[PDB]
């Protein structure tokens, strides 16, 4: 009956597709992004595009345009946002879309109602002339949106900006099965074959929806938060990381979420605090989204005042995992 489960496998395959690209750049750097954030943003941008610049975007997010009518896409997206925004009671989960237009700017009326309806976007007017001011205005949106986790989204801001599309997502949950602070103990982490870092290692012996998947050659542990969120951890077997990264699929994830069989194990999961700052312009090109960051870009659906294009695609995500839960936040700036 629900519409979103019509695009979820698309976002999920988009997530892995984008993941792989990011992993190919450097193999010694922590990765962390928000599939959803990056996708809903380009989703609501295509609304204001046309032709090959429009099609690349939609097809880049993994939508076989022939099989699924663009109309359903935006519709399933409008729904997906709905649900995500009405979180359980023990779990807070917010996301928001914001539009920053220049004062003179006359928009193509349609565009506005479409995003203001299909993406529950907010609408604002700024004087980009005053960079510092306009810059600061936009960072408070993401700062308040993510509750202070992401604060310096935009650093530089082109004097000639016509408009800016912003997105954010905040997540805070608690583990059903918490960790005892007393146990957290410093242990070794074998980063490299020659590099070893000491990391505070959380511990807890007990029932866990853990399990060794021979197909993946990984240990697959699922952890529930109090609410509508589960966390899947993949511990690749010695020398098989790459094999794990290449074998992930949207339907392989579903399997694990369906199963629930518990089992006793002495787990040691380190507590982290990592982040991800990216300029997705190049990585998006590897996935076919290029015409938009080009001089052939058609942003006509946005305004007739002038031919536009995108200069950047900045994404930043922050993650915190401790002995009581997980709070991550992400933000997309277009």
């Amino acid at each position: 009956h629900p519409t979103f489960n019509k695009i979820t496998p698309n976002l999920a395959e988009f997530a892995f597709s984008l993941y792989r690209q990011l992993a190919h750049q450097s193999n010694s750097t922590n990765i962390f992004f928000s599939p959803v954030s990056i996708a809903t943003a380009f989703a609501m941008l295509s609304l204001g595009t046309k032709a090959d610049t429009h099609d690349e975007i939609l097809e880049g997010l993994n939508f076989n345009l022939t099989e699924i009518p663009e109309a359903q896409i935006h519709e399933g997206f409008q729904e997906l946002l709905r649900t995500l925004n009405q979180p359980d009671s023990q779990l807070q989960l917010t996301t928001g879309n914001g539009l920053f237009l220049s004062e003179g700017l006359k928009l193509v009326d349609k565009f506005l109602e479409d995003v203001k309806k299909l993406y529950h976007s907010e609408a604002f007017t700024v004087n980009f002339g005053d960079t510092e001011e306009a810059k600061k205005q936009i960072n408070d949106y993401v700062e308040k949106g993510t509750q202070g986790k992401i604060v310096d989204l935009v650093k530089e801001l082109d004097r000639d900006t016509v408009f800016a599309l912003v997105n954010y997502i905040f997540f805070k949950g608690k583990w059903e099965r918490p960790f005892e602070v007393k146990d957290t103990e410093e242990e070794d982490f074998h980063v490299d074959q020659v590099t070893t870092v000491k990391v505070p290692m959380m511990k807890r012996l007990g029932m866990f929806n853990i399990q060794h998947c021979k197909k993946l050659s990984s240990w697959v542990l699922l952890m529930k938060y109090l609410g509508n969120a589960t966390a899947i951890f993949f511990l690749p077997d010695e020398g098989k990381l790459q094999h794990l990264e290449n074998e992930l699929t949207h339907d392989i994830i579903t399997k694990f979420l369906e199963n629930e069989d518990r089992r006793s194990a002495s787990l040691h999961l380190p507590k982290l605090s990592i982040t991800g700052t990216y300029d997705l312009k190049s990585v998006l090109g590897q996935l076919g989204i290029t015409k938009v960051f080009s001089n052939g870009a058609d942003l006509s659906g946005v305004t007739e005042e002038a031919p536009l294009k995108l200069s950047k695609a900045v994404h930043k995500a922050v993650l915190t995992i401790d002995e009581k839960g997980t709070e991550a936040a992400g933000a997309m700036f277009l």
Partner: protein
């Protein structure tokens, strides 16, 4: 009553691993990552 009990397997996440947050209702991937070095931040 004291009966024999198994030795729980130990699982240490002390090496590069990948993970992801999923929203149960939609089953959509909220966040995804790969921890290679937790002290890099």
């Amino acid at each position: 009553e004291a009966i024999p009990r198994s030795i729980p397997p130990e699982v240490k996440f002390n090496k590069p691993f990948v993970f992801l947050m999923i929203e149960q209702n939609t089953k959509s991937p909220l966040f995804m990552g790969k921890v290679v070095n937790p002290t890099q931040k």
